[PDB]
Amino acid sequence: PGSIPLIGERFPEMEVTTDHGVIKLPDHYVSQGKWFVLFSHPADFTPVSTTEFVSFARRYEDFQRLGVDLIGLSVDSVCSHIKWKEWIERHIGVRIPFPIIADPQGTVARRLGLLHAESATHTVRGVFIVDARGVIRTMLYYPMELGRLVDEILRIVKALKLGDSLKRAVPADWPNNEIIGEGLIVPPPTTEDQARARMESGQYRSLDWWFSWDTPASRDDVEEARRYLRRAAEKPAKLLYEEA
Amino acid sequence: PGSIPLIGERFPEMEVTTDHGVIKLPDHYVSQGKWFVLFSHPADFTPVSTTEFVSFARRYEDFQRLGVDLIGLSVDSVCSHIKWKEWIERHIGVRIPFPIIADPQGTVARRLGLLHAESATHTVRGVFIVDARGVIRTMLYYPMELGRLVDEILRIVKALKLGDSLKRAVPADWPNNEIIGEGLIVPPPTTEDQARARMESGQYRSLDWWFSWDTPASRDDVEEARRYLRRAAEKPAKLLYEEA
Amino acid sequence: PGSIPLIGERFPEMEVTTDHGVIKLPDHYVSQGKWFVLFSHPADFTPVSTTEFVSFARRYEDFQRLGVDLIGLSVDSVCSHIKWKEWIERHIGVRIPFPIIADPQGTVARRLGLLHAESATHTVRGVFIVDARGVIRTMLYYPMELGRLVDEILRIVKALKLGDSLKRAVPADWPNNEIIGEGLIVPPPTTEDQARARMESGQYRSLDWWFSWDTPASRDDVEEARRYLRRAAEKPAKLLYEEA
Amino acid sequence: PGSIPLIGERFPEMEVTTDHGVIKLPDHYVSQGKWFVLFSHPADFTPVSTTEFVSFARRYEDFQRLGVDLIGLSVDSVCSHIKWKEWIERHIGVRIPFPIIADPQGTVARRLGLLHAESATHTVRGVFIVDARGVIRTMLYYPMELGRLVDEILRIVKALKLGDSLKRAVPADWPNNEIIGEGLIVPPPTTEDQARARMESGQYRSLDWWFSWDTPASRDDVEEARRYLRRAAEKPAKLLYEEA
Amino acid sequence: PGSIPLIGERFPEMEVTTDHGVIKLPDHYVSQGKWFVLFSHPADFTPVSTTEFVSFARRYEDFQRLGVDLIGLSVDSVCSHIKWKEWIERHIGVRIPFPIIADPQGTVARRLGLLHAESATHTVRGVFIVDARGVIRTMLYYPMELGRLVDEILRIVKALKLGDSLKRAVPADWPNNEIIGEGLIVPPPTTEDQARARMESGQYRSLDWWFSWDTPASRDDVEEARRYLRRAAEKPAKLLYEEA
Amino acid sequence: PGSIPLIGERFPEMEVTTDHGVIKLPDHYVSQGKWFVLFSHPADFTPVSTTEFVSFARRYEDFQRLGVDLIGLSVDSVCSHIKWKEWIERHIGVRIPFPIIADPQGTVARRLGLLHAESATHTVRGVFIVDARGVIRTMLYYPMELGRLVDEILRIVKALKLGDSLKRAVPADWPNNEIIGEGLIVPPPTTEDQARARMESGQYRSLDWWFSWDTPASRDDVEEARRYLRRAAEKPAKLLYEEA
Amino acid sequence: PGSIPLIGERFPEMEVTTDHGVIKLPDHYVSQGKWFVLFSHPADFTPVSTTEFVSFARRYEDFQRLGVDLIGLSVDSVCSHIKWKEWIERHIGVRIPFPIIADPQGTVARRLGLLHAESATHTVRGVFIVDARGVIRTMLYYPMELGRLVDEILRIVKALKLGDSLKRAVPADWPNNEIIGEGLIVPPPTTEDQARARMESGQYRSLDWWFSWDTPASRDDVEEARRYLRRAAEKPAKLLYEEA
Ligand SMILES: CC(=O)c1ccc2ccccc2c1
Ligand SMILES: CC(=O)c1ccc2ccccc2c1
Ligand SMILES: CC(=O)c1ccc2ccccc2c1
Ligand SMILES: CC(=O)c1ccc2ccccc2c1
Ligand SMILES: CC(=O)c1ccc2ccccc2c1
Ligand SMILES: CC(=O)c1ccc2ccccc2c1
Ligand SMILES: CC(=O)c1ccc2ccccc2c1
């Protein structure tokens, strides 16, 4: 069994050695007003890991649009990271522009609970989504044998940033929720007086005093988020292996 | 500042009280050859949680077709669970056919690391995907303010089952991987002799001795996986709040 | 076994979440010059608990006359508390006006020793009677299977406030004591000189130097206390189940 | 700062010295197939305590008829116990037929949590109701300044024996509950399947699937319990101090 | 076994509850320049203990002339103490004028090692002779079955007070020592130089350098002490049980 | 500070070295059906200690009549014991016939609590009265400055053996008790049934059910006990310092 | 085993009770510029111990001439010490002029490791040779059965004082060493340079760079030490038992 930092906590204060140099987490991103997604992979020159790095690199523009930086993590050293990045550029034609943490003694990995029973020595496929205040907002642990759906990582940061700016909770499968579609949920009342006040308001569509929603998201916000999902659902036009 | 069970561990032995009665995890499901998705929600009669239960309930037959059972969890008691289910059936027209664990002293929540800094008293939106051997395969921690993408939970269980069956690793964004499309990855060589023998046998398409793949997934398996992501990407024709 | 606060101790300082808001105990009631009865029930949408909530609600005016506020407690959450109150108002015609604490991790339950061996997860039927100084004056532990006699809780607070205001101890079964009727007892001498001064004085009816009494309670005080017990002994005029 | 034994626990094994001899609790009463009420008082030759011993002795036949015995407890020694009983018989005309525990080192007091903050040295007015299996069923803690309502101890024991024999829970204020009067509650369903089958049985009057009741108590058992509360409510015809 | 305070130690600082009120030991006596005898008995309304209280009461003036107060101790409460004193004055015609400590939790009993193996719950017949500086000078432990010789307690305090004021040690059986009669012992030399100087002074009757004595006690001092032993030896003219 | 063994406990098993040889306590005396008085003195060739050794020696026949052996104790060695015994025989004309324990490391002294605050290195004037079963019956602690009353030690053993043989308790100042003279007390009733049975038989003189006595002692028992006290009270015929 | 103070350590600070009064070691002797020989014996009025005391007493002037005081030690008390000195003066005709420590709880014994397996209760024949700075210079432990050679104790202090004043080491059997006779050894070089600088000087007789000596002791110094050994070797002309 293992130990983790938690949703709602500040990302633990640490210096990390990356292939772009030493950076301090979370302060390096906080000071820039930037969210970051820190993710891990078992080892360099591994095939599922390579496909994830290519997926992330291809979506890099979508992340920069949301004010989100990316940072990778494996127990491999900076030299392996750089040779691996060179290999991907040369054989796949995709430059990886974001840093990768070298975690040789698994100092960062043990702090983030990235070592699971599947490997004593290599991190699983962890994801920490950290907001511009350096707070952990979402944590995912995918295994060695299964690649992530990177479009879901985009949907999560887009939905979270929306939730924060409009003061709303996001329904299941947004923006295609099967009850309220692209509707966003008003935080429910926490007192009986508040409940009564809302159900006399008439200000929101309601199924009950605890279930109110409106549609305050721009058409652009809704279609941006839906575009992530359509990309994930779409059979690719040209497979990159053909031209490699 | 919390501790979780880990991918590759057995789901911890525990007797739990559900609105369907008392069961032993993971035995109850192992003895049936079933996988199970244990997920949690903060409290009954909450709006994001309600949208997630309807979402799971609409996908119930998809889960059942894969041999996956569902079981929810909150700190609310069985009588609340049943009253909440009655409300959903009555007001939304959707029956919740799967059990919900009652965890009032947070005994299960603490074992599974479901209590994060966002609330000392209520569980975040955890997901534990457990195979028919009772082994944790994947763990997701979504926060109070953000509903899950239930189609990604279907893609995860479908891809892991395919990977176990076909002895393959699954590329990022499968079945729409940008490098190899619906291709599955051969576990890479672990020795130099194996590396040489792989590259000499010419038995698979390859970018290097560590990156080989084939297309062994049935057309039905691929299309079922694409169907989950197409549903995720499409706005439903009619929203359930309209006939509510 | 387990642990409890004790008669004569200050109610433990604690912030609690109720369906009326967050309040500090006992400060919230001290600061209003009010006694409070804190009571617990196992779970929302339980029948004995429902009968007790209705009994307390019917007696709300009687507690208000004594400057006593009511606060309930169960491990269920506030949304369950509010839905349960709405069910009682709709189906029995009785509005519950007093707050209910939500104690999902049993934090308040353990502090007040409300978790007995009958249930690891749900509180028994505890009663804490607390005066306007925040001092615990009386504690009752009724089990899952037995509802409380709420008229005895009225008699307890009425007789305690009478004792406080007249400097008197209250005999068994007051105001219908089989020795002295509605009489109240003078605190006995604690020294041989006090015992002699008392037997020389002739100020009180006495059976001995340690058993003196008088009748300093108003007929209003006596008859109000007797009314509580006559209501407990009275077959009700119309059963609330009929009116539904 | 105190530690109590708990409802549902076996009364703790102990040898006690009484003014009737040495006995083992709860074995002495279990062996006779008896329930017992253990109750405490601060000291011999105290006036509220005397009024309570007289109340219990007056009700002794009522306890005996229920298969219930009484045992007292203070920190005073056996010779003081016998002198006090003699004083009560001589001066009030009432024989105390049941034993009193002598607990001079507070060993029994500390085991049962009978030392509260009102007195470091002297027991409050504790009540332990123990069944014929030796299991604690109810616990009451009255203070120094307030006598018990002994008719409520009779109602507690009668209602418990009825609930145990009829497999029913007992409503608030039974047998005068304002919702169902002298009706007794069917323990609610613990599963959705039990809840459907119960609603579909039409076997019982119901307000909901979790609130069902019938009237299986004999007229005699109901009238026995109403008798206790009528005695509590009525001013005695003559007071024992008058003929003293 | 068990522990005790020791000769030469200060009587331990403690607040005690007596039938005359609350007092601090040893300060209450120290502040008056009075010695005290603290003594204990197992329980009120015991026959040997009654004989000893009557013996002490008969000797009260004799103690008073030495500037020695008396204070008793049992584990019974002050109300038992006062009832017992009343019984002695009524039935034996003797008033007990000195306080008795009430020690119901054995707090004082455990501090002074008065709980011996004869009873786990009741003090043996302890005696603590404490001077006006609050220092324990002598300790006696009589058992349950054997009354004290109170005249020996007077001889101890008289002999100690003479030893103190005349700077002398007191021989065996003083004032009727078989070797030197009413003589008192010069404390022996502690050096060879002191030993030679004592023997070269011829100031004292001596049997050796270590055994010197004189007769510095007044005739009044010696006769007071002979009177205590005379009274112990002579049968009383009139037994008190005659006119019961 | 300070620990001791206790009345009612077996004298602690120990081998001691005496000026008569090595002996096991208490087995050496138990084996012969003898009681023993163990007493201590600070040091050999001390004046008060010398007077007490002569007092005990003069009373040796009186101890032997009762079946009681004497054994002394100090921290001085065997050779010093024998040289001190010789000095007493030579200078006072009195043989000391009983053994003295040598306790140079304070092994026996620490076990019996004979090291009080008056001296860290020398034993106070302890007295342990041990019966033929090896049970400690009475313990006295006299200080450095005050010699014992040896006649009181005879009266204690006599009165104890009499209590044991006649199944009686011994009143204060026996056999010159101011209430009942040479009467011995019947151990009081411990139950109400025994108290009633006693007060009915009229078998004894009674002041109450707890205070019964008779006069079962032989005139020899009474007069031998009084003779010890008359000896304590009598001015000696000729002082032993005279013939020296 | 056991535990000692060591050569080169300061003698442990302690206040000891002697037959000359209380003194502080080593301060009492350091403050006078005097060495001291502390020596132990098992018990007073033992024959080997007596012979050793007479041997020291005969050599008292030889010790004084060196500025060496003597002090004995047994577990016996000061009164025994003084009586034993009286016996020696009267029966042997020898005065013991030096103090003896009284150590009845073995406090000093345990500190100086004087309690060996030969006796748990009495010291062996310890010798502590302490210089005028309070430093332990030599330690001898003779057993119960073997008296010391007191002339070797004189030889040790004389040779140490010569070594100290002349900056020399003392050869085996000095002043009759078989290699260098009354020669004293120059402390050897501790470095290569010093070794060379020694052999380059003709300053001293040498067998090697590490074995240099001269004859710096005065004839009187040598003759003093020879006289101690000549006394050791010679049978005394008159044995003290004869004129005793
Ligand atoms: C090439 C490389 O990754 C690397 C990184 C850190 C090192 C630290 C110490 C020594 C060699 C290293 C090589
Ligand atoms: C109705 C309900 O949720 C429930 C669940 C568990 C319980 C355990 C003990 C007592 C009452 C309970 C009620
Ligand atoms: C609706 C409800 O009972 C409730 C109360 C408190 C909560 C705190 C955090 C998250 C959800 C909550 C739901
Ligand atoms: C009758 C009474 O109070 C009593 C009971 C037991 C005892 C045991 C030992 C000594 C005295 C006792 C007195
Ligand atoms: C008079 C008496 O024994 C007494 C002493 C202390 C008490 C403390 C609390 C309650 C009653 C008490 C009675
Ligand atoms: C003479 C004396 O007191 C004595 C007694 C016993 C001993 C045992 C061991 C060593 C010395 C002893 C001296
Ligand atoms: C006479 C003697 O050696 C001696 C030594 C020390 C003492 C300490 C306390 C009491 C008496 C003592 C006698």
Side-chain angles (χ1 to χ4, degrees), chain A residues 20 26 30 45 52 56 90 96 100 106 121 164 178 184 214 216:
Chain A
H20 290 188
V30 165
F45 297 101
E52 295 181 307
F56 274 112
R90 187 134 185 280
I96 313 307
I100 311 167
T121 56
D164 292 349
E178 313 108 296
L184 290 183
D214 54 359

Side-chain angles (χ1 to χ4, degrees), chain C residues 32 36 39 41 45 59 67 94 108 125 127 139 144 146 155 164 169 183 200 205 230:
Chain C
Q32 308 171 59
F36 62 101
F39 77 100
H41 74 278
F45 295 106
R59 283 159 181 78
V94 167
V108 184
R125 295 181 200 282
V127 188
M139 302 170 272
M144 299 312 194
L146 211 219
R155 193 189 72 88
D164 286 355
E200 285 165 1
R205 283 154 282 183
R230 182 190 309 121

Side-chain angles (χ1 to χ4, degrees), chain A residues 17 76-82 102 104:
Chain A
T17 305
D76 276 340
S77 305
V78 163
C79 288
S80 295
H81 289 355
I82 299 180

